[PDB]
Design a protein around this ligand. Structure first.
Ligand SMILES: Cc1cc2nc3c(=O)[nH]c(=O)nc-3n(C[C@H](O)[C@H](O)[C@H](O)COP(=O)(O)OP(=O)(O)OC[C@H]3O[C@@H](n4cnc5c(N)ncnc54)[C@H](O)[C@@H]3O)c2cc1C
Length: 502
């Protein structure tokens, strides 16, 4: 009857209860002063973007599942999730007054949109007397401290980055907040009085406006599934200890790596928790792998890309990007849409592009293959176009990680040995000589013998008819001949590399 002010936590990333310092500070404070505070954990959902085509339906569904899981977990603590519809610029001045907000917390984000939006709300909060407290728990280290320790610039090599963060101190990992005590549900504000369900978690139908893009629900969203999935990947301590990234297959029928990337992108899983549990396993396993190929090395790859991205607001762009080589990519809408829909005539990369569309995840080396094909390998199209397609279809779509890896693959930054080119025919044969992966995702070739399913043009016309799929009618011809265009493109990279040094 005497709760006079509301404490608010604001989810954007960090969609978990565990290891969430911003959220547990609100819960601790509320329990330390029983009867003074109402608590409101909020997510702000702008309905204007549900139609944006850069967010595929698979990612929308992941988000719906994550928010439901989050609301369920918060109910066990005598709270709940409040999903507020609106744009933050209009929501915060209302609830600041209406809920009499005393404190606001959230996890920090380095993406340029977030940085400016957060600065706006900080300004408004200072004016309105609201104390703001932010925490850096999306990453293991704080990119500003690593850039500081490096005398003001981001390290541009992996090994150098490791040298700095070795000097850094590792944050302590928190558990879950404790059940709220002596706290009734908050009284209804002006909009809850008009509709008691106005802040309820949205249904699938409300979030997924194009249900026809949905594929099979292989990777459910949310913290509960995140933690369950981590535990099973660590149950086999020897597999964890001897993990070597380049030796995992891109084209096995079940994933050869952890597929924790979607959960780390949304914050359903704490990277700091994952890192600590991995440290404990390395400790008691005397022969283990080392960075960069080890599992801890993979998390360090995430950390590296986040800190260089923090220093450059054009990280997702060629021009204005201080890291990125200026390379004269060409435009070809026909080649681009063929790549985009997995109709290039190279069965291996077509199968990758179709797994991506249907399922929303593909293995790291599968990404290397289709990215190299689109850019410096064959089509000579800008990595920005590949970033665009990946952004639509990837569950783990991440601003820094997508752009950084595309600049790497296209030899625009961080990696410069452009003479190495992946072969669209040969690369996958090493790990799937029978072509099971191709048969699953390119089912029109599923009756081809293994001796030509990677290169169906080697089959005669009589054989093609026997296999049930003739090139040019049931499956396209190669849109380019790899063995000639890749030689040309190696020359153009040398030309562009001269112009940049000069
Ligand atoms: C063109 C291209 C685009 C990419 N875009 C993304 C993206 O949008 N989102 C994304 O999360 N990763 C991206 N990656 C990196 C990498 O391919 C994925 O992180 C990884 O395949 C996810 O599978 P996993 O969780 O099983 O990885 P694991 O091998 O199990 O590694 C564990 C975790 O380490 C991190 N990690 C692993 N490899 C990398 C890497 N190369 N760079 C950065 N972090 C890494 C991720 O958090 C990952 O979940 C991209 C790579 C390429 C070549």
């Amino acid at each position: 009857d005497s709760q006079r002010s509301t404490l608010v936590h604001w989810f954007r990333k960090g969609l978990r209860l565990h290891d969430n310092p911003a959220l547990s500070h609100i819960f601790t404070a509320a329990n330390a002063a029983p009867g003074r505070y109402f608590v409101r954990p909020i997510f702000i959902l702008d309905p204007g973007i549900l139609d944006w085509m850069q967010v595929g339906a698979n990612r929308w569904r992941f988000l719906q599942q994550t928010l439901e899981d989050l609301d369920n977990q918060l109910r066990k603590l005598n709270s709940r999730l409040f999903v507020v519809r609106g744009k933050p610029a209009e929501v915060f001045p209302r609830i600041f007054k209406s809920w009499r907000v005393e404190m606001l917390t959230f996890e920090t984000d380095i993406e340029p949109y977030s940085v400016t939006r957060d600065a706006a709300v900080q300004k408004l909060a200072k004016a309105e007397g609201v104390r703001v407290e932010t925490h850096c728990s999306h990453t293991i280290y704080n990119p500003e401290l690593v850039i500081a320790k490096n005398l003001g610039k981001a390290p541009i090599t992996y090994q150098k980055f490791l040298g700095i963060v070795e000097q850094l101190k590792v944050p302590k990992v928190l558990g879950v907040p404790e059940k709220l005590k002596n706290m009734p549900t908050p009284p209804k504000d002006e909009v809850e009085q008009k509709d008691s369900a106005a802040y309820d978690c949205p249904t699938m139908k409300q979030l997924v406006k194009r249900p026809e893009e949905l594929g099979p629900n292989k990777f459910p969203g949310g913290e509960t599934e995140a933690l369950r999935r981590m535990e099973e990947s660590l149950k086999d301590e020897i597999w964890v200890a001897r993990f070597e990234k380049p030796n995992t297959a891109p084209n096995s029928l079940e994933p050869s790596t952890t597929v924790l990337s979607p959960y780390l992108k949304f914050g359903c899983l704490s990277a700091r928790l994952f890192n600590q549990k991995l440290k404990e396993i390395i400790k008691r396993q005397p022969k283990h792998s080392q960075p960069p190929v080890s599992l801890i090395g993979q998390l360090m790859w995430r950390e590296f890309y986040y800190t260089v991205a923090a220093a450059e607001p054009n990280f997702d762009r060629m021009l204005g990007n201080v890291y990125c080589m200026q390379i004269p990519w060409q435009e070809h809408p026909d080649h681009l849409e063929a790549w985009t829909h997995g109709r290039t005539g190279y069965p291996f990369i077509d199968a990758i592009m179709r797994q991506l569309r249907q399922e929303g995840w593909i293995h790291h080396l599968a990404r290397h293959a289709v990215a190299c094909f689109l850019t410096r390998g064959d089509l000579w199209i800008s990595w920005e176009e590949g970033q665009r397609v990946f952004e639509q279809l990837l569950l783990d779509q991440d601003w820094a990680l997508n752009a950084g890896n595309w600049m790497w693959l296209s030899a625009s930054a961080f990696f410069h040995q452009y003479f190495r080119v992946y072969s669209p025919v040969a690369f996958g044969k090493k790990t799937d000589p029978q072509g099971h992966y191709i048969r699953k995702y390119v089912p029109e070739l599923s009756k081809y013998p293994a001796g030509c399913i990677y290169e169906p043009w080697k089959a005669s016309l009589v054989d093609q008819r026997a296999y049930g799929c003739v090139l040019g009618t049931d499956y396209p011809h190669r849109i380019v001949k790899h063995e000639v265009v890749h030689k040309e493109n190696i020359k153009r990279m040398g030309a562009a590399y001269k112009v940049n040094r000069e």
